[PDB]
Write a protein that binds this ligand. Structure first.
Ligand SMILES: Nc1ncnc2c1ncn2[C@H]1O[C@H](COP(=O)(O)OP(=O)(O)O)[C@@H](O)[C@H]1O
Ligand SMILES: Nc1ncnc2c1ncn2[C@H]1O[C@H](COP(=O)(O)OP(=O)(O)O)[C@@H](O)[C@H]1O
Ligand SMILES: Nc1ncnc2c1ncn2[C@H]1O[C@H](COP(=O)(O)OP(=O)(O)O)[C@@H](O)[C@H]1O
Ligand SMILES: [Mg+2]
Ligand SMILES: [Mg+2]
Ligand SMILES: [Mg+2]
Lengths: 524, 524, 524
């Protein structure tokens, strides 16, 4: 492939122009007054979104040299999204400013690497000052406020997420799904629920409910595929004599069991119901042990050393009450020893802290929530699918912000936290004059989010920036009410993790970009 | 893919131009005087239709930026069609007006999101006022009038649908099909009819009829595939002694049965006929239970715990009289206990209210109609297929409008309902001046359907709008007779659900569209 | 696909231009003096035809907007062909006139839908007046005259079809095939003939004839595949003792039978021949029952309850005399009970009147003709294949016209019937002035066929139209002799069904076309 090369300022000019095209589209979204971008999906209706990471992945430029600049700043937004749902737009705005100021310094002949070292020195110091500025958030009032700000000032979204925050507990997982009702509704599942349904419609003992309710059940957690009632019988006889209902969890079941079960249940000899084991593989096995510990029961298994037919009635688990639908299994309140259950939750927590796949760790979190916490799903409600998608993105970002707020605390919102940290690090000096110039580039860039929110509002950014810089503590401009007040008091709060992540990601990519002296790309 | 980006007014201009191209084609159809659009089907003759949703899906523009605007307003018409058959054109006209007025306000510098909040505040209030304005419709005179208006003023269509409305009852389902006779004919099926036919032509006991009529039959509702008369015999012997005819419903049947049955029937030993079970799968099983409850009989099944050959004569169902053709099975008046049948209809109604697939819910409605209501099919009649298609769309829309009218009542038609609700919500004020401007945009847009119907008539829209706005109650312009009168008295009625749905869908998509500040699309 | 849209007059102009291109090609053919169109078949020689439906399917225009108009008027000719073979050109001429007059009225600002209602009101009234004008045709003199006019004034074609009309009877079916002899010849098959031939050349008992003639045969109509003489023997022994010849009709036959049959027949022990059962499937079974009823015999079948070998000599059918060739089977005059045969013909007639597939109904008509009527084939004769094709189309149209004439009577030909009906409906008035204008458009269009026939002759259309309109009854212009006289007396007769069908089809498509206000089609 023939390669066209460009050098020095000419290369840096096209690279900056590409950064400007990406930054401009993301910049319009920044702020409560920020508008939305209609990204075009060719196979379908265009999508209207205020999410910066969404816009970033979409843009690429036909000028190859400009595209290289755009692709490199796409990274800061993408990693910010990986860290936390919010901060993707603010990271891009900070990165754009560091690149613009840095390129001007490189043009003055300042050594690019020395400026990079200076920028990094300032960022490391700033992150520490953000931790000092941070004050912890766990008040549900504060949790709602971080959610509301994260949802483009939607009070209802923050209010609902705080309640779901409340009900699930810390181990709990909150999820969002499309709900066709135009109002949002929150449902919190109680106890261990697996998404599997009764094998036979005949099993239903409550037809109006359409569900099988077994009060006081014993529970068999079985290994393997079991289509021999033929072999399982003496266990079954003992249960029939005992007279408590039974649940069978198992992997593969014929009519050999189900018709025999209908013969027994529907004519009132025995009281039984049966469900398919969740998911597949060794993940189903690991899960079955969690159920066994909860139910005061056993994973009853040939491959772990029991003939299944040898099982005694004490070898099974027990619990209060179960309800099963065609999609749903719920289990109320286990016989299992509380310290054993807490031990398994902690033993799982060791797996959670060691977990090398975050997505696998989420599944572990779902297992933590079934075992001790709760699962909450928020039904995002909108008249049209256009509205549903933008609504869900705002609710998802609120979910991520609330989690970040609890973990590492909260800082003043609207960019006043970055302004205050920059003022406190003004005397920070690097080893050489280029490092000193680099430190200044980072501090000036930190004022950029406040300026852009004010620009979107339409007020003069510099005049407002001067008033906020002149002010102290959390004094800041409320963009929505166009007034100056304490941000914490006015409810404008940003999670510390998202602000710290935005600075670190922007500085790393921007610092490398200023050092570029040659660009090599395919000839047009 | 190289992406070309546009910003601010330039982006909004092309987006509005795309909305205008779609809106203009749908607008011509609005009103009784509205003409028809010849959409071109490349594989076949072009289609002449007055249906807005049909036109909307068809249009796309080669200008990529304009196409994005057109695709987004296609949604309001498409969702309106999903909600109810009618309202697809009115929703587009309302949406076009809100976008045009909103874009002008955004040009004045009004904050786009604040206008969106104001528009939403007005719409929520307007929907409540439409419910107050709504008066219930169930008079067959009124049901015919909503059908007639929904069929471009076809009196015969409304008249026929009211009768079919009458005969089926509320649980009943009405369907439309092409009928080659040039006059429309309605046929109402009575009782449970499944579309399956006699397995053997030899079964016919009434050759001139070409159908098997069994008077006083017993009915076997069988499980599984049964090609062993070989095994079924002792049941069959008991019936032969009893001397009432029998029907066999079953899944798979050889000549092992049919020739033996011909040997018995055609030489007068026994009196029998046999049909194939309807559809396939577990849906056939769920259906067979409904037949069993109706016939005072049983789903006789190995897999639900009976050897089939053990069945007694009391274990079967019974009914008055059956008739079977090569396509058709009809069953007259069952032995089943009325409260058991009503219970199963209610138990099914629980499934209906829980039903997550609407299309599956329709099949449940067909099962409700076979069990307690009726099924009516309207044979749309036209000289040519060009005429048949436009005729059927008008009859289909009338079917949807009549159902909507019964459920949520009726409002004045011709746009006077939207004009009256807008007048009653004039003092509604939002939190800030942009929200106040947003409320006004929605109220002005509500006058748009009346204006467009008058424009299609050719009378001056503003002069008529002023007279209707000056008037009160249901006073409105009868477009067909070019006169002003009470709409309810003149028979111009619109279902409340369709008017409310049009406003809500238009407001949601339009409100998002005004907020757009940047558009990203593939380079031409 | 990018869509280019056009509106109002601009759209109507291109649509009319497309109608004009199609209409012009079909118009030249109208009239006895009308010339022929050389449609080009790319894979082969071009085809010279005077048939309008043939020309219509061929034409399409490269201008997309013009093509949409052409495709829509293709429908009126195509449906006219489906109704009856003739009337395809006259329907196009009537449709073109209604569209031209209607578009001019829409240009004057007349409401398009109101004109459509007026046109429809006039057409409904005109169809009733055509029924009053109609006088029944069944005289073979009149039947020949409708055939002659339908064959571009070919006296021989009408004369031959009247004789074939005569011989077959009403239940009879007449067919046309290419005959290489340059003179047309008619052959009428007598009685039941199926197109199957002797299985063995050795069966021939009359070698000079090349056919097997069995005088006084018994007939076995067998079920299934039978290659066991091995099993069939005791029946065969009884026949050999009886000494009347036998025919075997059956599905699949080895040399196991045929060599054994040659051993018996060719050495004079037994007298037998054997043929393959016609077609395939259950249609062959339904047909075999018709043969059984005719022959005073039985479908002898295991699957309908007889072991085949149990059959007695009375269980078979009998008839006068059979002749079989390698292609042909003929059966002369059955033993079957006449009221049973008439009953089966009537029982079949119930199937005929119920018949949902017209093409399947034709096969039922062939079965009606074999059972009670006759089958006649006309061998179209021409020197070249170019001539054969045009000759056959003219003979086919004559066949369709003669059938239409007998069913719904005859009206004056040359367009004078449409002129007279239009004069009688002049005072018909619609509800509003646009409906009145619509009625006038239809009446003026009805004069169009007469004008176009006169234009093709070369005489002034308006001068002749005035003389015919001034005249009364059947007074009309004989185009061939360029004279004015009573049409019935001069032999110019048109079937009422074809004239009524042409008006109805033209009005429906034309009425929709005038209402078009926007056209949407793919960008060139
Ligand atoms: N009234 C407000 N005052 C100032 N800024 C606000 C206000 N409300 C929300 N914000 C937000 O403005 C910034 C939010 O950025 P945003 O546009 O939501 O995308 P992202 O969080 O991904 O960067 C944050 O500084 C946050 O404070
Ligand atoms: N004579 C009439 N007066 C005013 N409007 C009428 C009259 N008859 C029917 N309409 C209709 O005009 C509008 C019907 O819109 P329409 O063109 O049928 O498509 P859609 O219902 O999908 O919006 C409704 O306001 C309805 O009232
Ligand atoms: N001598 C005649 N006088 C007037 N018209 C004639 C004469 N002979 C045949 N015609 C025919 O002219 C019209 C025949 O139309 P034709 O060209 O055969 O195609 P099509 O029947 O499909 O419309 C009919 O009105 C018929 O009467
Ligand atoms: Mg954010
Ligand atoms: Mg409508
Ligand atoms: Mg003709």
């Amino acid at each position: 492939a023939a390669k066209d090369v460009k050098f020095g300022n000419d290369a840096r000019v096209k690279m900056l122009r590409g950064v400007n095209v990406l930054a401009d589209a993301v910049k319009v979204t920044l702020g409560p007054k920020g508008r939305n971008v209609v990204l075009d999906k060719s196979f379908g209706a265009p999508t209207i979104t205020k999410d910066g990471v969404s816009v970033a992945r979409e843009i690429e430029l036909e000028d190859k040299f400009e595209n290289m600049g755009a692709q490199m700043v796409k990274e800061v937004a993408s990693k910010a999204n990986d860290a936390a749902g919010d901060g993707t737009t603010t990271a891009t705005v900070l990165a754009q400013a560091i690149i613009t100021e840095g390129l001007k310094a490189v043009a003055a002949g300042m050594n690019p690497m020395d400026l990079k070292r200076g920028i990094d020195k300032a960022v490391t110091a700033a992150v520490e000052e953000l931790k000092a500025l941070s004050v912890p958030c766990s008040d549900s009032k504060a949790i709602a406020q971080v959610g509301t700000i994260s949802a483009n000032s939607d009070e209802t979204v923050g209010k609902l997420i705080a309640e779901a925050m409340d009900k699930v507990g810390k181990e709990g997982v909150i999820t969002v799904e499309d709900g066709t009702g135009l109002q949002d509704e929150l449902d919190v599942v109680e106890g261990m629920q697996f998404d599997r349904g009764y094998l036979s419609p005949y099993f239903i003992n409550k037809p109006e409910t359409g569900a099988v309710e077994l009060e006081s059940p014993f529970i068999l957690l079985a290994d393997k595929k079991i289509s021999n009632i033929r072999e399982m019988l003496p266990v079954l006889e003992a249960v029939a004599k005992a007279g408590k209902p039974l649940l069978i969890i198992a992997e593969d079941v014929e009519g050999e069991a189900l018709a025999t079960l209908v013969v027994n249940t529907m004519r009132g000899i025995v009281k039984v119901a049966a469900v398919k084991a969740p998911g597949f593989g060794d993940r189903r096995k690991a899960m079955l042990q969690d159920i066994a510990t909860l139910t005061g029961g056993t994973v009853i298994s040939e491959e772990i050393g029991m003939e299944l037919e040898k099982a005694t009635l004490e070898d099974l688990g027990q619990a209060k009450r179960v309800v099963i639908n065609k999609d749903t299994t719920t289990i109320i309140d286990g016989v299992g020893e509380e310290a054993a259950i807490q031990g398994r939750v902690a033993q799982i927590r060791q797996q959670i802290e060691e977990a090398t796949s975050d997505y696998d760790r989420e599944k572990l979190q779902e297992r933590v929530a079934k075992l001790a916490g709760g699962v909450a799903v928020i039904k995002v409600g909108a008249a049209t699918e256009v509205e549903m998608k933008e609504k869900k993105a705002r609710v998802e970002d609120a979910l991520h912000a609330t989690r970040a707020a609890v973990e590492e605390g909260v800082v003043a919102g609207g960019g006043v936290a970055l302004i205050r940290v920059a003022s406190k690090l003004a005397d920070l000096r690097g080893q050489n004059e280029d490092q000193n110039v680099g430190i200044k580039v980072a501090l000036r860039a930190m004022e950029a989010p406040l300026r852009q929110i004010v620009l979107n509002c339409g007020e003069e950014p510099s005049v407002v920036a001067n008033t906020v810089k002149g002010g102290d503590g959390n004094y800041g401009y409320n963009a929505a009410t166009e007034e100056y007040g304490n941000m914490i008091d006015m409810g404008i709060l940003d999670p510390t993790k998202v602000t710290r992540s935005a600075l670190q990601y922007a500085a790393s990519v921007a610092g490398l970009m200023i050092t570029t002296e040659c660009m090599v790309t395919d000839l047009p």
